[PDB]
Design an enzyme around this catalytic site. Structure first.
Site, mmCIF file in Angstrom:
data_model
loop_
_atom_site.group_PDB
_atom_site.id
_atom_site.type_symbol
_atom_site.label_atom_id
_atom_site.label_comp_id
_atom_site.label_asym_id
_atom_site.label_seq_id
_atom_site.Cartn_x
_atom_site.Cartn_y
_atom_site.Cartn_z
ATOM 1 N N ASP A 187 -3.196 -1.514 0.857
ATOM 2 C CA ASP A 187 -2.575 -0.201 0.626
ATOM 3 C C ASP A 187 -2.604 0.533 1.956
ATOM 4 O O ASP A 187 -3.614 1.137 2.324
ATOM 5 C CB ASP A 187 -3.269 0.619 -0.474
ATOM 6 C CG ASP A 187 -2.732 2.055 -0.680
ATOM 7 O OD1 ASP A 187 -1.631 2.379 -0.148
ATOM 8 O OD2 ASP A 187 -3.399 2.843 -1.390
ATOM 9 N N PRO B 63 -10.710 0.942 -3.958
ATOM 10 C CA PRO B 63 -10.518 1.526 -2.625
ATOM 11 C C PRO B 63 -10.179 3.005 -2.597
ATOM 12 O O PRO B 63 -10.224 3.609 -1.524
ATOM 13 C CB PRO B 63 -9.433 0.634 -2.006
ATOM 14 C CG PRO B 63 -8.653 0.124 -3.167
ATOM 15 C CD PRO B 63 -9.666 -0.075 -4.252
ATOM 16 N N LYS B 64 -9.881 3.593 -3.763
ATOM 17 C CA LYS B 64 -9.503 5.000 -3.829
ATOM 18 C C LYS B 64 -10.650 5.918 -4.191
ATOM 19 O O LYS B 64 -10.506 7.116 -4.087
ATOM 20 C CB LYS B 64 -8.291 5.211 -4.751
ATOM 21 C CG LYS B 64 -6.994 4.640 -4.143
ATOM 22 C CD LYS B 64 -5.758 5.174 -4.875
ATOM 23 C CE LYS B 64 -4.552 4.297 -4.661
ATOM 24 N NZ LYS B 64 -3.786 4.717 -3.467
ATOM 25 N N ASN B 65 -11.811 5.378 -4.500
ATOM 26 C CA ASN B 65 -12.957 6.192 -4.890
ATOM 27 C C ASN B 65 -13.533 6.958 -3.670
ATOM 28 O O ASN B 65 -13.687 6.356 -2.601
ATOM 29 C CB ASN B 65 -13.983 5.254 -5.573
ATOM 30 C CG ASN B 65 -15.300 5.905 -5.828
ATOM 31 O OD1 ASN B 65 -16.074 6.108 -4.915
ATOM 32 N ND2 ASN B 65 -15.503 6.402 -7.021
ATOM 33 N N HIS C 76 -8.388 7.719 2.027
ATOM 34 C CA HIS C 76 -9.810 7.557 2.395
ATOM 35 C C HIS C 76 -9.983 6.536 3.499
ATOM 36 O O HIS C 76 -10.762 6.776 4.421
ATOM 37 C CB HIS C 76 -10.654 7.166 1.179
ATOM 38 C CG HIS C 76 -10.606 8.180 0.092
ATOM 39 N ND1 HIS C 76 -9.996 7.906 -1.120
ATOM 40 C CD2 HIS C 76 -11.053 9.450 0.072
ATOM 41 C CE1 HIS C 76 -10.108 9.006 -1.838
ATOM 42 N NE2 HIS C 76 -10.752 9.953 -1.169
#
Ligand SMILES: Cn1cncc1[C@H](O)C1=Cc2cccnc2[C@@H](N2CCN(C(=O)OC(C)(C)C)CC2)c2ccc(Cl)cc21
Ligand SMILES: CC(C)=CCC/C(C)=C/CC/C(C)=C/COP(=O)(O)OP(=O)(O)O
Ligand SMILES: [Mg+2]
Ligand SMILES: [Zn+2]
Lengths: 403, 315
Positions: free
Chosen positions: B143, B110-112, B148
């Site tokens: 999170d 999920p952080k890309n 993003h």
């Protein structure tokens, strides 16, 4: 005692959760308990605290990484110029020389990353992107030889920057890519260093960056987004390059950044209510020299003549005590694995915390052993100030490319 | 006909029959290499084949399936993402199946940056934001501070005018964690783009809500930053009751945030020609000294700077 973080009164700086527990307070308390164990270790082992930058361990880790990396780095296969930059800059901060053969091998590798259409890709044959373009130009300026300067195709670089330029003043990171404040900084950094800034390249850019400053005082990735240290550094550093820092409310910015230093840990957090991280030693503390220069240019008479507007001592203590990996390299926080990115930024932030300068004034604060003193870093470019002067002087003997 | 990269029966592209015609292209790292990654066999194999399909610009179904493996190996490879988007259009791929795929990959990483940008491109192409708010809420459920996710949420809301239920979602997340700064940011984003803060009833409601939050959790910096951010606009000195109302929390709900806010009120009063000018200045300078020496020493240099600044301007 002589270390701020080890004073008995420092225990009062622990989290006050007001008996209201949430994910935020729980995660913060865990980090604080872990840091307190690091801070207390001297007392528990009955040893005199000794703050030593493990130069030789860091150098071994760096000299090796410059040639070869494990498959843990597969996730950085489209970021190879970043790895050149992180390592070469960490070696420059540690006063380690680049053998002329290595300088040549880096030049040749960065040539392979360079796109025939301008800018650099994250590896040989990869499409160009602003983040490896910034890293490649910075790495070539660290080498600073005629061969390194000549790698950069200045005409194609300008054409590339123009291809990313948006009508609202912003820049794409790459063709068909994303827009955020990092892009304005990557473009302003490479364009100023290589002397390719035309009168209209940055038209509307300062105004677009100023729209990213929010209600908190800091800067978000795009207008409306939460203020963040990485984007705030990018925004302010790009405005310094453009000579447009006044487009921002500098006082709400000063208040937001200073508030990001953690009272307990001594290091900086990236955003309000998030955890400390060693790399924010550069992104956040690197804003204080930029703000000092900005306020001084406005003739601020209340500015210090010896210190930055953050606790230089508490930051050095966090870095030296919590961010060093015993095997060499630096890290985010205790319990995290070392990496070249944290090694680069922890050492960059250490250099900033050690070296104050404002016109005629020069004052050093070196915590621990005197051998801990690093080479200074330019707060705008995050490369040696001598490398900035040398590159700018070299590229200034070339005309700004025509259409 | 997918053969998952983690499947126990996954086979290297060099050992695949349907790929025999193509020669893999090795990476040109040069004679004396730098920052050379010792790739795993699986990585080297997919990337040598991706280099071959890219170099020859093969817009095939096999090249398309290959990009899924190359993305799975390194989801930050933007060259791969560009080629996958060229293939989605050239091959006329069902974009709703591509949305199912992006949903799965964002759930995993999920952080890309690249995954969220691809999802935005798909939403633009389809002109369909119907799944967005519920998909983002599922990422935020894992999170709640994912930068993003919040950025994609603001883009969605602003682009498609989906303002109506956002303040309610903000209220729910604030109940869960009043300390979540991304949620206080969303609150400001919603209000400033709908009613605005010029509406006196909105401002009053916001200040009261924030003050109640501060009473419950006095050391929560987010609520204090929010109260300051919504009032600093017109100037803190414009609200005469605020000072007395905060000075009434001095014994009970004190913190270096309350003290710092008092100094911000005093700074503004001193800039707007207030009554008892010399008294305000000394009150402010006393708080600066208390902050620098006792209550907020990590910010000693900041508080000393403010002290000197106030003296220089208002002496
Ligand atoms: C924002 N932040 C603050 N502390 C850390 C971050 C982030 O993890 C972060 C920082 C960043 C900043 C500039 C350039 N590249 C990166 C890159 N890092 C990835 C991890 N890494 C790294 O060595 O990992 C190994 C090989 C050890 C697994 C260092 C480089 C990255 C790539 C994608 C995303 Cl979403 C975030 C990030
Ligand atoms: C020149 C250049 C490319 C600079 C990059 C600047 C930088 C560090 C950007 C980070 C951006 C971001 C979305 C962080 C969120 O991650 P997070 O969850 O790690 O943030 P957090 O640490 O506050 O938790
Ligand atoms: Mg991209
Ligand atoms: Zn970090």
């Amino acid at each position: 005692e002589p270390l701020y973080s080890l004073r008995p009164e420092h225990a009062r700086e622990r989290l006050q959760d007001d008996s209201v527990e949430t994910v935020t307070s729980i995660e913060q308390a865990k980090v604080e308990e872990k840091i307190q164990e690091v801070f207390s270790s001297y007392k528990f082992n009955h040893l005199v605290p000794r703050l030593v930058l493990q130069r030789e361990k860091h150098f071994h880790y760096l000299k090796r990484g410059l040639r070869q990396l494990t498959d843990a780095y597969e996730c950085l296969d489209a970021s190879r110029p970043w790895l050149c930059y992180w390592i070469l800059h960490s070696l420059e901060l540690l006063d380690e020389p680049i053998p002329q053969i290595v300088a040549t091998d880096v030049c040749q590798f960065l040539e392979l990353c360079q796109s025939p259409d301008g800018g650099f890709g994250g590896g040989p044959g990869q499409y160009p992107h602003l983040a490896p373009t910034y890293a490649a130009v910075n790495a070539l300026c660290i080498i600073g030889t005629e061969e390194a300067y000549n790698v950069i195709n200045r005409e194609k670089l300008l054409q590339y920057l123009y291809s990313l330029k948006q009508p609202d003043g912003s820049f794409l990171m790459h063709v068909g890519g994303e827009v955020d404040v990092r892009s304005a900084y990557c473009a302003a950094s490479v364009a100023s260093l290589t002397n390719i800034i035309t009168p209209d390249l940055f038209e509307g850019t300062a105004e677009w960056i100023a729209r990213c400053q929010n209600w908190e005082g800091g800067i978000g990735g795009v207008p409306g987004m939460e203020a963040h240290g990485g984007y705030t550094f990018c925004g302010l550093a790009a405005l310094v390059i453009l000579k447009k820092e006044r487009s921002l409310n500098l006082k709400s910015l000063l208040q937001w950044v200073t508030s990001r230093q953690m009272r307990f840990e001594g290091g900086f957090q990236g955003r309000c209510n998030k955890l400390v991280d060693g790399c924010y030693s550069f992104w956040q503390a690197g804003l204080l020299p930029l703000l000092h220069r900005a306020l001084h240019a406005q003739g601020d008479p209340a500015l210090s003549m010896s210190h930055w507007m953050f606790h230089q001592q508490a930051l050095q203590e966090y870095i030296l005590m919590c961010c060093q990996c015993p095997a060499g390299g630096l890290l985010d926080k205790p319990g995290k694995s070392r990496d070249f990115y944290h090694t680069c930024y922890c050492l960059s932030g250490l250099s900033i915390a050690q070296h104050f300068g404002s016109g005629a004034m020069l004052h050093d604060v070196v915590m621990g052993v005197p051998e801990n003193v690093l080479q200074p870093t330019h707060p705008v470019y995050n490369i040696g100030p001598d490398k900035v002067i040398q590159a700018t002087t070299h590229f200034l003997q070339k005309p700004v490319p025509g259409f | 006909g997918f053969l998952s990269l983690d499947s126990p029966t996954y086979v290297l592209y060099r050992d695949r029959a349907e790929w025999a015609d193509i020669d893999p292209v090795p990476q040109n790292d040069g004679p004396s290499p730098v920052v050379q990654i010792i790739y795993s066999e699986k990585f080297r194999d997919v990337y040598d084949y991706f280099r071959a399909v890219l170099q020859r610009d093969e817009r095939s179904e096999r090249a398309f399936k290959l990009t899924r493996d190359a993305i799975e190996l390194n989801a930050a490879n933007y060259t791969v993402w560009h080629f996958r988007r060229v293939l989605l259009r050239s091959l006329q791929k069902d974009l709703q199946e591509e949305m199912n795929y992006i949903t799965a990959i964002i759930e995993e990483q999920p952080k890309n940056y690249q995954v969220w940008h691809h999802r935005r491109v798909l939403v633009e192409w389809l002109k369909d934001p119907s799944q967005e708010l519920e998909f983002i809420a599922d990422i935020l459920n894992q999170d709640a501070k994912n930068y993003h996710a919040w950025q994609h949420r603001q883009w969605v809301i602003q682009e498609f005018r989906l303002w109506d239920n956002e303040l309610q979602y903000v209220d729910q997340l604030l109940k869960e964690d009043v300390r979540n700064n991304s949620v206080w940011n969303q609150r400001h984003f919603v209000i400033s783009n709908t009613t605005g803060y010029s509406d006196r009833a909105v401002l009053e409601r916001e200040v009261q809500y924030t003050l109640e939050m501060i009473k419950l959790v006095p050391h929560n910096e987010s609520a204090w930053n929010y109260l300051k951010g919504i009032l600093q606009d017109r100037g803190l000195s414009r609200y005469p009751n605020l000072l007395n109302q905060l000075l009434d929390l001095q014994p009970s709900h004190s913190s270096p945030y309350l003290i710092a806010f008092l100094v911000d009120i005093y700074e503004d009063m001193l800039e707007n020609q207030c009554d008892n000018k010399e008294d305000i200045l000394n009150k402010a300078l006393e708080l600066c000294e208390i902050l620098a020496k006792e209550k907020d020493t990590i910010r000693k240099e900041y508080w000393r700077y403010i002290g000197r600044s106030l003296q220089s301007k208002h002496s």
